[PDB]
Amino acid sequence: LSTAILKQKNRPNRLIVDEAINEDNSVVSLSQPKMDELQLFRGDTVLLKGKKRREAVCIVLSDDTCSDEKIRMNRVVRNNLRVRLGDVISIQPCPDVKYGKRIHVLPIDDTVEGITGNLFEVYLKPYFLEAYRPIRKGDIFLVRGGMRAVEFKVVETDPSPYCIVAPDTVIHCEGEPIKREDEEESLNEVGYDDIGGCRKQLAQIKEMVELPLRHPALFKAIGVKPPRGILLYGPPGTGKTLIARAVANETGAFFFLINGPEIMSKLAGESESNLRKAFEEAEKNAPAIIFIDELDAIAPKREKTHGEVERRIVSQLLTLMDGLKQRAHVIVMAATNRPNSIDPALRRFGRFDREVDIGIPDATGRLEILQIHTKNMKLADDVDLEQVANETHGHVGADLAALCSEAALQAIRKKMDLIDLEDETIDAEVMNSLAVTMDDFRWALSQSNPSALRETVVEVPQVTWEDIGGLEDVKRELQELVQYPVEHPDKFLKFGMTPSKGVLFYGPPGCGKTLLAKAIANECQANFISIKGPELLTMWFGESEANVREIFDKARQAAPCVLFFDELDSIAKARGGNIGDGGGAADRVINQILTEMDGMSTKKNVFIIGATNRPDIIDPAILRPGRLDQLIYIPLPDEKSRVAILKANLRKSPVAKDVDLEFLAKMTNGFSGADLTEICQRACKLAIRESIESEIVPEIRRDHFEEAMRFARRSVSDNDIRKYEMFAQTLQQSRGF
Amino acid sequence: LSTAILKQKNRPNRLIVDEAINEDNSVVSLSQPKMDELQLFRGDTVLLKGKKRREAVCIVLSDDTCSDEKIRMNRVVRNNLRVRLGDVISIQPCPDVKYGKRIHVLPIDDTVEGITGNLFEVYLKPYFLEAYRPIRKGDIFLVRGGMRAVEFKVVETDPSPYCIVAPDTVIHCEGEPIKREDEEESLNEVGYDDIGGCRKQLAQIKEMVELPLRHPALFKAIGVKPPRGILLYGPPGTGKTLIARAVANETGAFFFLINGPEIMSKLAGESESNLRKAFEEAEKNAPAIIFIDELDAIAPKREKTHGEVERRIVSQLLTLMDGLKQRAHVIVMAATNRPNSIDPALRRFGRFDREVDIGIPDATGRLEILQIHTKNMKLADDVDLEQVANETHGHVGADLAALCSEAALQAIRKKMDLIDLEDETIDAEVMNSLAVTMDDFRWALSQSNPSALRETVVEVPQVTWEDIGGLEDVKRELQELVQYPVEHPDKFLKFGMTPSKGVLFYGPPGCGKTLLAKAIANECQANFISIKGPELLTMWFGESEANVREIFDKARQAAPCVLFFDELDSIAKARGGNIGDGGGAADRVINQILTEMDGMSTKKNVFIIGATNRPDIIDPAILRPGRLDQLIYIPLPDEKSRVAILKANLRKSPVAKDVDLEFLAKMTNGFSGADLTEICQRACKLAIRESIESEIVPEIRRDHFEEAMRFARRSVSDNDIRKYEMFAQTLQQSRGF
Numbered sequence A, B: 001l002s003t004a005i006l007k008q009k010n011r012p013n014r015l016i017v018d019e020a021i022n023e024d025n026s027v028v029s030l031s032q033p034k035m036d037e038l039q040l041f042r043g044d045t046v047l048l049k050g051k052k053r054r055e056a057v058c059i060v061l062s063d064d065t066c067s068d069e070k071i072r073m074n075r076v077v078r079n080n081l082r083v084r085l086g087d088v089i090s091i092q093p094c095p096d097v098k099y100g101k102r103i104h105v106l107p108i109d110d111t112v113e114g115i116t117g118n119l120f121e122v123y124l125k126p127y128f129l130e131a132y133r134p135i136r137k138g139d140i141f142l143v144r145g146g147m148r149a150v151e152f153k154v155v156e157t158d159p160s161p162y163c164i165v166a167p168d169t170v171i172h173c174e175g176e177p178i179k180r181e182d183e184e185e186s187l188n189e190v191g192y193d194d195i196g197g198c199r200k201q202l203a204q205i206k207e208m209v210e211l212p213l214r215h216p217a218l219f220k221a222i223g224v225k226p227p228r229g230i231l232l233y234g235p236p237g238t239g240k241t242l243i244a245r246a247v248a249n250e251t252g253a254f255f256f257l258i259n260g261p262e263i264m265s266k267l268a269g270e271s272e273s274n275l276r277k278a279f280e281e282a283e284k285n286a287p288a289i290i291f292i293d294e295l296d297a298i299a300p301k302r303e304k305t306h307g308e309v310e311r312r313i314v315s316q317l318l319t320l321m322d323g324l325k326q327r328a329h330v331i332v333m334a335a336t337n338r339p340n341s342i343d344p345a346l347r348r349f350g351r352f353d354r355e356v357d358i359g360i361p362d363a364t365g366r367l368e369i370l371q372i373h374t375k376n377m378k379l380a381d382d383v384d385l386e387q388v389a390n391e392t393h394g395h396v397g398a399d400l401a402a403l404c405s406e407a408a409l410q411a412i413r414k415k416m417d418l419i420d421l422e423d424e425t426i427d428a429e430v431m432n433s434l435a436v437t438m439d440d441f442r443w444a445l446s447q448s449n450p451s452a453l454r455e456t457v458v459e460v461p462q463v464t465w466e467d468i469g470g471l472e473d474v475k476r477e478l479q480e481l482v483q484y485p486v487e488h489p490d491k492f493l494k495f496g497m498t499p500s501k502g503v504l505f506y507g508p509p510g511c512g513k514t515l516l517a518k519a520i521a522n523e524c525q526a527n528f529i530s531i532k533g534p535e536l537l538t539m540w541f542g543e544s545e546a547n548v549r550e551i552f553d554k555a556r557q558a559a560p561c562v563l564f565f566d567e568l569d570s571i572a573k574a575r576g577g578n579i580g581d582g583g584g585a586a587d588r589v590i591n592q593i594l595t596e597m598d599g600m601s602t603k604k605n606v607f608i609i610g611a612t613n614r615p616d617i618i619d620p621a622i623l624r625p626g627r628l629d630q631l632i633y634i635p636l637p638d639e640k641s642r643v644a645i646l647k648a649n650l651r652k653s654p655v656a657k658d659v660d661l662e663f664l665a666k667m668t669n670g671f672s673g674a675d676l677t678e679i680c681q682r683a684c685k686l687a688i689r690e691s692i693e694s695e696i697v698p699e700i701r702r703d704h705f706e707e708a709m710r711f712a713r714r715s716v717s718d719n720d721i722r723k724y725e726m727f728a729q730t731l732q733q734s735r736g737f
């Protein structure tokens, strides 16, 4: 429902494309049963429509040699118009265009090779006799008096719109033909298909941008105001600017583009005028989209800035933003990677209010990007992109761009024998055969460019219950605390209770407190934000406490979300202990957390979870009803669960059939799940000491586990086990003395 | 494979040089079996190619008197063209150049001595009869009507390109002949051979700079984008600017050079124009390289800078950087020693993204520099440069330059008798004989200029296992933790384990924890970054915590790397102890380390190692699985290892045959390896008390060791030995209470 703009199917006038024989591109197909639906008439022009604007306007009709539900058409219309198969041509005629002084007439490429003379006469002139030219600017097709093809372009403008011309007219061949490059920048020009990884954010942009522009009567009918303020933001390199020029190409609205730096590089008293000129050009031209790219360049905080020409431009922009009446039909967009450095006044109601967040893409989204990049490359058969896309984490769209680049250049090194640098233009017997293998993507993925931007990430964890041995009651217990209130709202208001929003895990180390949290976030299919305690205490050597307020906020957009504060013992030991230097646990971040924890509605779909293995030093305030009032003690695994731990840890290993698991599980008593996973890691570490020596077979054996069990060491003491059972019994008391 | 651009061999047209008799340099050699490969024709011109551009274009062919695979040629072509032997002349003809108004005609040196008149007529005129002048500007050769040689230069330009001229023409002798200096600045001009110590960084510069320029079709073919943003950085004096003018001389691309200060010294509103003029001059001239030297002069952070003419130039540069379309074929380079003071916006994708790091050279690299400097000097026979290059550590390329200088000037002092300062031009009987001895390099290497830039260094240690007595299991044990995952990736994914990334050494003082780490970094041949704890705590009196984030980053470029945090006890005692003032160990840097330690992939090739001799105060958080979960206790040496310690410590000493080692080893019980090394140092301290007295023989004797053993003192207590065996047994428990 949030994607509902992607919906496009079932338009009667909407149909696919297929073969033509006719290499004079004047023609356009028909269909006999389709005209039955249509108004179509003999002669002049159709408006056929397609991807990314530009279209073809020329003579039409007679066909049906090829069958129908598909459209005949001249395969040059594929280099023009769309990319290729499967999409739609959209046709209605636009008849009887005006008769002018004739139009255009200039070549591009192959006319310069060979004998020219007066050109258009030499080759093309016989082609128009009483046919005369329904035409549009931008058509490039093959025509000759000769070897049977050369392409051709357009120059002159008598009117701006397209014509059906007459003779007696004056035209000119007097120009110079041209090179390719002007064509590629038409074909490389970006559409909605070059962006990948953001579906959810495009659905919000067309609802905000496109829909009010084309259909202003809608909001006018239900009586609602369109926002004029869209503000895009995200980390560097995430494709913000890219979504700009996509929407530039995809609109029927005049598009003006302001570069923040380009405004500031100007002289004083002048750059004040460039803005005033940009808001005047749009308002004149009916609907329009102004886009101010890199906004925080021109508008930082009036409280920290120096020059008076810097403070005007910010007060200049405010005075234009309020000069927008709905009558004008103008939408102002903007893009910034530092949304918190923007002047606060710009983000208030009536200026920039709607926000759209372009985030770091996840493993699905970054696969979609890798495919948009490499679709021009030639790849080997050993290339598994679903394998690559899994191995790149901190990478945003611009890193995958520089990843595909460092792999191609690694392939050019294996070829450095057959390339010379002393030669002028090298042979093409390598130029064709040079392809990119997976052995390269392993090399690029290990290099510098893997250095990438990495900060708070919000995603569904990949760990399911199947990764967790034992603990079957808490799995049951958690599902109630999280699923049912989010899944079944009817049950709770009925019986009159309000759900509780928070949970505290406690127990000995290594018993799975982290796994339980990531697991339930995957079952509810909610988002997961994880902040380890040592990260709370680090940032304040630079002294920024807004980063805690920023995390609760960030989880609010991501609702439904579980917000998991891990290793709370590290914060309560930030003083060293209860006796310690003599502080309590509450200081620093904890007072800022208990505050922000209370600003969240009990109806909220965000759900907080703590964890600590030091229940003695957690301060009384965290445990209050309304904060984390659900306490759950996770014990060491018993003997029957140690069976279940060992099994799940080995699901990725080539264990032998003869290894007897429940033999281990009952000889290991004070071990936690961290200890058993450590046994398995050494067992495989003794299997490799064979494997390399066995060279100078490969399935881990029953002897190795025997060997590992010797050194194995119990991580939880005999006194610890007891003491946890003291807090396991009553930690409610705690607070109050 | 990363060096693959150095590859140059097997070009058919590529061959060496050898003797000619012919002192009229118009000629150029041939070969009879080589022309069989060639197209070579009789008369006019060849393009012969060589080192650092400039070449010779003149008559060619007839030879074979001298044998082939070598080339005859006139030894003046050696002062021109290359330096000397062993390199290549590269030849193809460029026939039939145009017939002009004649060209040049002006002398340099020896014509001013003697009788001139009208010059060119007096001596050189008979030399051209129906031979007429295939020629190029820059040839300097011997010609006379007279004593049989004087050299000669070029002045006029009728066309820019070179000519085969005719008579009836008008030329002029009307200029004034000239001094040498204009020639030396041609010969001292810097090539790729003046730089030394960076091979790995040049391979990256030609892949980034040269290859896209000469061969833009390559990246166009495999469909990849060349970077326009190369940014060089490093400490002062490391030869950044030097790599600039090398690439200046070595390119066929127009080279423009911006000096940062020279931009800023200009008036306001003007220096804005000098940049705009510099990006316009390049774009006009096809491929081109703009180099902005000392970048951080013009572009510091827009958040800390004052004047508005300082903020324009930064927004001026941003607006030019984005005005670069690939069509332009321009690469913008830059150089800075303060990469973290550059405005953040310049380093984002699409502006300056590729980085190349010119580091402090190591002992090999600085030997290569010393040889590039002293190759003009006359050296004595006592000079061992491999000995000098070992003794200079904090020295970068510009210190070795000022080292070779302070040694030459020390040699001029021993000569101060035969030099007078009251004389005008001193005698040359010293001017020839003055040479540089090793007794000087000892003096220079002890002086001020040894004061040098010294900070974090990344290198393979010079200590191998042979330096370490005993500890044979940990040597085995370490190799698995480090080598096999880096050497044999096949074994680990097979059995399904992920390797663990970190190790914690603990034990009593002086037992070799430092040696074990440096040793395994040498065996894997990986890089070694060492940060002693007291260095973590010092910088924050200036309050900079980015230096911890900067160390993990720095180890990431250096992968494979071992990152060794030494003396962690000093950090955990930064409060004084557990009871202490009442803190825990975690504060300060430790919370910033545990954070940065987690941002490193388990697939990473960087490997972290800690060490502490105070296992009681290390905080629980370091030991968590995923951080340092491998604990290894290094015990005091037993009796059989104390034998092995004493032997390795003495490998550099003239021990007598009669000294009985295992006698010592069993009378020393509570001693650690630090204690035994201390015995050996006093034993040699008692040998020198003889040696000087023995003057008023030299091999250390068996008596001395007897004498030292008396005072020897046990550094580890009797209660310490026990207590370590308590933590040696269970330190896993630790965390959790």
Ligand SMILES: Nc1ncnc2c1ncn2[C@@H]1O[C@H](COP(=O)(O)OP(=O)(O)OP(O)(O)=S)[C@@H](O)[C@H]1O
Pocket (backbone or CB within 6 Å): A194, A195, A196, A197, A198, A235, A236, A237, A238, A239, A240, A241, A242, A336, A337, A369, A372, A396, A397, A398, A399, A401, B348, B349
């Ligand atoms: N989601 C995406 N899908 C496809 N390509 C992408 C995506 N994101 C980035 N790219 C590519 O990588 C480059 C990233 O540049 P942009 O996204 O335009 O810069 P940005 O996201 O505005 O970040 P800045 O400019 O540093 S604040 C673009 O040239 C794209 O070709």
Ligand SMILES: Nc1ncnc2c1ncn2[C@@H]1O[C@H](COP(=O)(O)OP(=O)(O)OP(O)(O)=S)[C@@H](O)[C@H]1O
Pocket (backbone or CB within 6 Å): A467, A468, A469, A470, A471, A508, A509, A510, A511, A512, A513, A514, A515, A516, A613, A637, A645, A648, A649, A672, A673, A674, A675, A677, B624, B625
């Ligand atoms: N019940 C369990 N089932 C499966 N694996 C477990 C279990 N308990 C612990 N482990 C293993 O122990 C490791 C750490 O588990 P966590 O969930 O991080 O434990 P924790 O409660 O966070 O305690 P620490 O101190 O952070 S190790 C994981 O790699 C798991 O494979």
Ligand SMILES: Nc1ncnc2c1ncn2[C@@H]1O[C@H](COP(=O)(O)OP(=O)(O)OP(O)(O)=S)[C@@H](O)[C@H]1O
Pocket (backbone or CB within 6 Å): B194, B195, B196, B197, B198, B235, B236, B237, B238, B239, B240, B241, B242, B336, B337, B369, B372, B396, B397, B398, B399, B401
């Ligand atoms: N790697 C090297 N090989 C040979 N000579 C070097 C090397 N590095 C420095 N030198 C010499 O020492 C001088 C160092 O100056 P540069 O390297 O040009 O300055 P820099 O490295 O840009 O440092 P700055 O200017 O203080 S940021 C040069 O004149 C070189 O002659």
Ligand SMILES: Nc1ncnc2c1ncn2[C@@H]1O[C@H](COP(=O)(O)OP(=O)(O)OP(O)(O)=S)[C@@H](O)[C@H]1O
Pocket (backbone or CB within 6 Å): B467, B468, B469, B470, B471, B508, B509, B510, B511, B512, B513, B514, B515, B516, B613, B637, B645, B648, B649, B672, B673, B674, B675, B677
């Ligand atoms: N096993 C050993 N073999 C050879 N030399 C040793 C050994 N143990 C200690 N030493 C000597 O002791 C000195 C210091 O050794 P380190 O490796 O620094 O010991 P450590 O574990 O760092 O303890 P400290 O407190 O730093 S001395 C070196 O000069 C070594 O020569």
Ligand SMILES: [Mg+2]
Pocket (backbone or CB within 6 Å): A240, A241, A293, A294
């Ligand atoms: Mg941008």
Ligand SMILES: [Mg+2]
Pocket (backbone or CB within 6 Å): A514
């Ligand atoms: Mg954990």
Ligand SMILES: [Mg+2]
Pocket (backbone or CB within 6 Å): B240, B241, B293, B294
């Ligand atoms: Mg410099």
Ligand SMILES: [Mg+2]
Pocket (backbone or CB within 6 Å): B514
């Ligand atoms: Mg040491």
